[PDB]
Symmetry: D2
């Protein structure tokens, strides 16, 4: 081991060029050879909008397996952009290793002009292989930037630069074939996390309900009746709740559903409010809130413990 | 001369101190709220001849389409009058973008309509509301403000109602339009106009609602991993005319979402694919069901879809409204 | 009929490899479906070495091209470092409503995931579109359409460097389609008064930085070398130290125009009658300088120049 | 009981001796801390100087050694707080909270920010999770690291930002939410001690633009500058005129530091270009470090390593 050993797990199609697909990827971008000893694995093949808790769970298990081996220094997972933040945050909380776990994606198809995936892959591999990258949590790498799974989110439908943490910034950047680490997230993750799900084959059902003018109560009932253990509320402003939403939350709590108030806004803190039902999501966005609420619910259903989870994770 | 500005209030005051030390409150017994407001910021009197009017009294999270409808119609009456040069509207920050965009589409006047709000309680140390109102009144009263569409004014910034959004739950600077910027900024008691929106609005808008008392039900459904079909069902069952998909990425749809959407379409519901991301273009994609939302975020998409649905059920017409408004 | 678009190259190509402009056109052959393009190698330098004299000629050429009825628009390949300067110059001096689209690339043409190919394609689409007319000069990169008056390189090294934080993008290009969002509320192009077609050189204008312990000797240097104007990349909102105030006042005595701008990157420098010189409005140093050069060709009267800075 | 926080003032009040006016104007601070006002100086940040910042550093170190000071809040003008704050970032030998604070609106102005800015700043200094995080600038509900934070906008409340690096934390609902820890050396881990020094090396900043003059480099040389920070075009790019000027300076043993006028991001190494590169330090920050750098060494390599690690 002189060049590091990197396993590129593919969860979908290639993001570079045009076998399994993970072989097309590595063929298309031969320069990763010079960065690391790479071995492909086509873990799954789906588009990220179809990625599912059950599979992310299998991916968390696979990645833990890989990072236990001594002949693997880090893992690069190719993933679609749409839910990479959800997958990433899941493995952020559940991977019991300091070894680097780098999600990578592309905002343009590999056949498109000026495709971003090739250089995205190169940056991702370089981040996984470099030994300064240990203990930073799960990372998302794209467009010269390194996001923390817990903070990074896809902020823009269709642009290369979509991945941003406006308030938290990037862990680091890759410019001129070199890595600049700027931040260490000040949250628990990976080896310091309490969430181990190597036992499980299934996760609690958690659904996200939006906040808006005239938001209907009936979507709360529906969700209760299909037996969710958690509702995340992508709420108006700072998790503000209409009379209708309060009513729906009253009825969820009575059935022992955990209600987690987040924000549709895009950024920032949802502060405690005891005049308002349910928990609050700190600075976790809806998609991240659900991921943590699910994992919370596999270990407890005590409001106070889960709340503290949201403040520390 | 000073212009004539009505200040419609929709909730509690955004300006006014309480009592600590030896000072006494600006919250008098039985005081209306918009009077509390105007008495708390007598510097507005220098900018305009203002007249308070308590239109409603709720937190913006409880603002309802049906109330917004009356607000639009109330504003139209005012702006038709000669004795009214512009209108400022105090509103909670949470859904001001929703209310603002409604009137952006439905006010048949070039006269400035400025929403104003506050992220800090009036009684807070360093409350933003005072200066927010001053700016808001200045923008409504200036002649250069005519024909710009409905504006949202807060933290020294003038946001178009079509683009502006609350991007942070808690901060003073929450209202941004990352890709579209601000129409203008207020700095040193001077207005600096930077942009005119290149979309239809107000007096060039077809969404007349002057004789309406009701609006089509539109609901919004989130896109996420393991997103349930049954939520589409639930919306359909409750008779929604439209569904706005707060979509994954560029309105990407899971197998479950596609199932739910093609069900909604069969029963005559218009599906509108937007994004949860917070920004950017959801492009056309004839591989996927429903229409797409251009750069309209879910909250805005709902408003335009509601108003389009008052005029048509024709997807091709609705889509074009979403590219032009 | 496709639109006819002349492509002026000011430097090396930004797409493909082997005139650089032919290498460019060939390397992205999809542009031929969008417009009929002729290439033309105006110059060949890195944007860093782009000079006022050369930019004047670029403006004059673009006016020649757009005077012709057989040209619907122009695309100008330019380096990222000073495109905002070149572009703002033409923004003010091109007497046409026809599209003028600066384009650039943050990665070399031969890099992995080079942005240049797609930037160019978008640039031509914008240049070729009829909704694009009368919007002023544009900078098109990373799916964005930036107004030359607002857009700036906000980052040393990133693809997404060109932003206008406060005033946003004129529009965006997503899925082979232009989405127009804003028209700049400022005078430009055919409503500009700046017509430099009779000129062969431009007044000398320098930019001095504001910072703790900033020296007056830099003002002296500027004055002694005959600058007609000085732009001040001021601390905050054009704030001036005692040393700055001395050097400005000395400059003003000598009849140099002083324009107080900001090093912050964004925002309004407002009027302050207690401080010397003029204020840049929301013009960043680099834009401020362009407009001061041109203003100096017509007037040396501070009142008139102040109005320019508020309306251009 | 409460922690003991000294408020040093470098100018007039930002709420309501300025520093007594300030504390009387914000009596809610005394429920957060035990506050001793102290009027260090009285100037607009525009006039703050290296020799004064050097004294402010020394003074702050004095206070932080005392057992009856848990941390220090420093009122300062917005225009150059980033320079002052980053100087102390590097030269304060203590883990105790050093929080700069400021206001974009004057104290008399409607909806002034100084009161809540100060309150927040005191809360950040009084909190015990605030230790060991570097010098901090607190304003508009945000805690920014001196090394990254900058005044991005001439005239706005929200001007203080670090687009790429983000905020160390935020204060929302009277509670501090720490987000990141800066992954750079600072305070107690810094090598820069200036408690001995009386004055500082001369470092000036020249802008990069079209038609930039060589003669300003000449002038800088002839007025005896020890370093020149280049606020360069794009990524430290240099015109032919800038190169010649930079070469002359390097001949004379002046350390040339290539930064960016762009306002954010990395200037990368480039052995074909003269001088050092500023990493992600903007011109204002780069000058500060180059100053302190030149008090220990004038070896390019060592200084370059400073720039990558501080």
């Amino acid at each position: 081991d002189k060049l590091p050993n990197i396993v590129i797990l593919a969860t979908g199609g290639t993001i570079a060029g045009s076998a399994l697909g993970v072989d097309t990827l590595i063929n298309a971008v031969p320069e990763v050879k010079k960065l690391a000893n790479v071995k492909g694995e086509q873990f799954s093949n789906m588009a990220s909008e179809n990625m599912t808790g059950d599979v992310v769970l299998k991916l968390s298990q696979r990645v833990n397996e890989l990072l236990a081996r001594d002949d693997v220094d880090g893992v690069v997972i190719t993933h679609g952009t749409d839910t990479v933040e959800e997958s990433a945050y899941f493995l952020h909380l559940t991977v019991k290793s300091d070894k680097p776990v780098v999600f990578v994606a592309a905002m343009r198809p590999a056949t498109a002009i000026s495709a971003d995936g090739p250089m995205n892959l190169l940056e991702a591999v370089r981040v996984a292989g470099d030994k300064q990258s240990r203990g930073r949590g799960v990372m998302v790498v794209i467009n010269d930037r390194i996001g923390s799974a817990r903070y990074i989110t896809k902020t823009n439908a269709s642009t290369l630069d979509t991945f941003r943490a406006n308030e938290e910034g990037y862990l680091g950047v890759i410019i001129g074939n070199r890595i600049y680490y700027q931040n260490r997230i000040d949250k628990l993750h990976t080896t310091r996390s309490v969430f181990d799900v190597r036992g499980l084959t299934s996760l609690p059902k958690v659904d996200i309900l939006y906040g808006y003018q005239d938001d209907p109560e009936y979507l709360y009932d529906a969700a209760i009746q299909h037996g969710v253990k958690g509702i995340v509320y992508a709420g108006m402003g700072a998790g503000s709740v209409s009379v209708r939403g309060i009513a729906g939350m009253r009825k969820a709590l009575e059935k022992g559903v955990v209600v987690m108030r987040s924000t549709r806004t895009g950024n920032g803190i949802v502060p405690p409010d005891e005049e308002l039902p349910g928990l609050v999501s700190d600075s976790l966005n809806p998609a991240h809130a659900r991921i943590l609420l699910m994992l919370a619910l596999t270990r407890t259903s005590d409001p106070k413990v889960i709340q503290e989870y949201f403040h520390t994770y």
